């Protein structure tokens, strides 16, 4: 995160930490006790899946306060539509080997209904993007979870405000600042873009990409989750199946 703040311990309790052999990979969003949502490209050439761990209730990486819950990701699910090493359809659904225990420090974010998401949430101006990612473009990643509030853009305005990068598809949306002052960065992929509505928080976006971090004339680009609610729900009700890495049909 570029230009945010430390998210006060327990105020971003749905925030997940994905590590591979103790090293920070990407973020995630707990949407229930055994499912986490992330980014499709976090899984690029991952070979040792026995080391891929999700941590819940985490805050300060430099210490272990005891609120942290860690689980092996039993399964990584992506859309059949995501092409390895690309940006389109950037999303993954992770099944925790064993469920986390809901506590003050570990709570899921609500996955909204698609029409709710599209009729109302997409019109709520600001949302929070968080992570333990880089503090600056070529800077160091944070020890304490950062949180940032960014304003959303309809794709036409985003395009217009952008200096003329991959294509911004219907599966994406832009959010942030074009003044090189605030954005998400390396280390925040998979992280939530969460929208506050009538007293409840909801998952609206996934940290995805940008033409650098907080680059003048550019906005952060997020996965448009509303496009996937149904795919995501069919999978959470589907009887569990074997592979470690699954590329499920989409739609």
């Amino acid at each position: 995160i570029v230009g945010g703040k430390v998210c006060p311990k327990g105020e971003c309790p749905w925030q997940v930490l994905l590590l591979v052999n103790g090293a920070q990979l990407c973020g995630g969003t707990l949407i229930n006790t055994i499912w986490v949502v992330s980014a499709a490209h976090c899984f690029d050439k991952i070979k040792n899946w026995r080391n891929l761990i999700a941590v819940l209730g985490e805050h300060d990486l430099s210490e272990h306060d005891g609120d942290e819950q860690s689980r092996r990701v039993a399964q990584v699910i992506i859309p059949s539509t995501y092409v390895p090493g690309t940006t389109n359809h950037d999303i993954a659904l992770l099944r925790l080997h064993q469920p986390v225990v809901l506590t003050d420090h570990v709570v899921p974010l609500c996955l909204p209904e698609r029409t709710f998401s599209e009729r109302t949430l997409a019109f709520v101006r600001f949302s929070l993007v968080s992570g333990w990612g880089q503090l600056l473009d070529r800077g160091a990643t944070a020890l304490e979870l950062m949180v940032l509030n960014v304003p959303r853009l309809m794709t036409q305005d985003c395009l217009q405000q952008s200096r003329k990068s991959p294509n911004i598809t219907e599966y994406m949306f832009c959010a942030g600042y074009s003044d090189g002052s605030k954005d998400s960065c390396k280390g925040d992929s998979g992280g939530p873009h969460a929208t506050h509505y009538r007293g409840t928080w909801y998952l609206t976006g996934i940290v995805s990409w940008g033409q650098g971090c907080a680059t003048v004339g550019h906005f952060g680009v997020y996965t448009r989750v509303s496009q996937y609610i149904e795919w995501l729900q069919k999978l959470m009700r589907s009887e569990p199946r074997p592979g470690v890495l699954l590329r499920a049909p989409f739609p």
Partner: protein, 183 residues
């Protein structure tokens, strides 16, 4: 769907209507308005009209800068067009004034006409809203003039005329001429 064009703000004494083109053919519209940092609010739901009253929204804060957008739909993000930015306080047009009365020097009185702005369910007058930003110009008849930051002129003796002015303005600085009065 075709995209609306020629988006124009029509505003007098805070009564504010956004107008566009073209007249629709198997297409509807919806307006969205917002201040720089607030949420977008939908108005005139799937309308066949080529206008949208937004007074109720803009009187919420006459000082704030608004933007509305017109979405087009067959009768994935919509097809839309953005409006000029509008700051009610600074651009609403001043409505045609009125001489309340006059009396014999002569003392001329201009009515303190109401506006579309409400405070605890009641319309505010021009003075409530502009305070000291508001000044008036009298014209008497060769012709003469007088200005005040109040609603009265005390002249030397007839036909008079008045015009409201927000000299501090860059746009829509002066109201029209009220209907003339003669003794």
């Amino acid at each position: 769907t075709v995209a609306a064009y020629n988006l124009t703000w029509k505003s007098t004494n805070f009564k504010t209507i956004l107008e566009w083109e073209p007249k629709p053919v198997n297409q509807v519209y919806t307006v969205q308005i917002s201040t720089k940092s607030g949420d977008w609010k939908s108005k005139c739901f799937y309308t066949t009209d080529t206008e949208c009253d937004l007074t109720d929204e803009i009187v919420k804060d006459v000082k704030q800068t608004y933007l509305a957008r017109v979405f087009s739909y067959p009768a994935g993000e919509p097809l839309y067009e953005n409006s000029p930015e509008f700051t009610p306080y600074l651009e609403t047009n001043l409505g045609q004034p009125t001489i309340q009365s006059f009396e014999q020097k002569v003392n001329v009185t201009v009515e303190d006409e109401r506006t579309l702005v409400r405070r605890n369910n009641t319309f505010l007058s021009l003075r409530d809203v502009f305070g000291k930003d508001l000044i008036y110009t009298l014209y008497y008849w060769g012709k003469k003039t007088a200005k005040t930051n109040t609603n009265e002129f005390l002249i030397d003796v007839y036909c008079f005329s008045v015009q409201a002015v927000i000299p501090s303005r860059t746009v829509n600085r002066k109201s029209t001429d009220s209907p003339v009065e003669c003794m």
